[PDB]
Symmetry: C6
Subunit: 68 residues, 6 copies
């Protein structure tokens, strides 16, 4: 397939779907996708928006499946 990453991330963003982001260091982040670009995902929780490098993301697990 082609050009699926961004539809996925935009669907999480627009639909405000809670996600679990599992990093290569074993940390698991939880929040909403606020925005993203070529290299980063901005992830918002109750406290803060943090900047996550995609290269460090293993998998993004949403609370529910999204339509792309």
């Amino acid at each position: 397939g082609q050009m699926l990453q961004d539809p996925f991330l935009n669907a999480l963003r627009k639909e405000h779907v809670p996600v679990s982001i599992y990093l290569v260091n074993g940390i698991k982040l939880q929040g909403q996708v606020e925005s993203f670009d070529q290299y980063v995902v901005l992830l918002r929780n109750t406290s803060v928006t943090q900047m996550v490098y995609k290269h460090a993301i293993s998998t993004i697990v949403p609370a529910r499946s999204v339509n792309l």
Copy 2:
């Protein structure tokens, strides 16, 4: 050889073959390949479709060998 990754992934996709995806952080995911693009594999289980970054995948082990 040349251009084998996508035939493999498409064969898993079309044939609905259960896979084990072993990530660089030691997590092992199980499900079916729903779709994929340059950078990601969308992996479906009973619960959810998650987005897996290829850069974090070490090996994809199918339940049976596939024809490319």
Copy 3:
């Protein structure tokens, strides 16, 4: 989205916002973003400015959210 990484880093830089940088090896660095370029972030604490490779950064957590 597009071109968000640098606005984020520049906002941390200009606003002098303390950050926690979580590396792929589990080290957590704390300080202020002094500068950055394509590949590195220069992070200043009480003692020193160190050069952090972006490829080794998992997430940058600011003490407060920033305006991009």
Copy 4:
């Protein structure tokens, strides 16, 4: 030197030489190289052909040295 990776992999492939592939996550795979492309090696054992991402391979140790 130049253009050695593929001669090595093709020699393992054509000669059917058993290999140990050591991944960045510490897993050690054993089998024969079935095929390979820019990004992946297809590794066959008694049970299955699995798809191994080169980016996750640290070293490929053959049971015997190969002629390139």
Copy 5:
């Protein structure tokens, strides 16, 4: 910012500043930067000059801050 990595490394080199290089595998190297190129840093201690791949470097901590 732009083009900061090399000024940093050259300043360590020219000024002979002792550094701690923290690798993604947790090893910490100590010595002086002898030279560097696109991909590597040559690090000298009492015993030897070793070749360190930048892709494996998380952070370079100097004994004192440098002028770029």
Copy 6:
């Protein structure tokens, strides 16, 4: 500096200098550099020539410093 990686590797190769190659997974390999290309180093010991991916190498420590 510029174009140092290959002079280093070729000097180890031509001079037959024993090396320790430290991989990102913590494995330490020992032998002589037999050859190398853009992506791999072929490392020979008493038993075998193995193919090491540069992306998995953290540092190459020679038994003695080499002239580039």
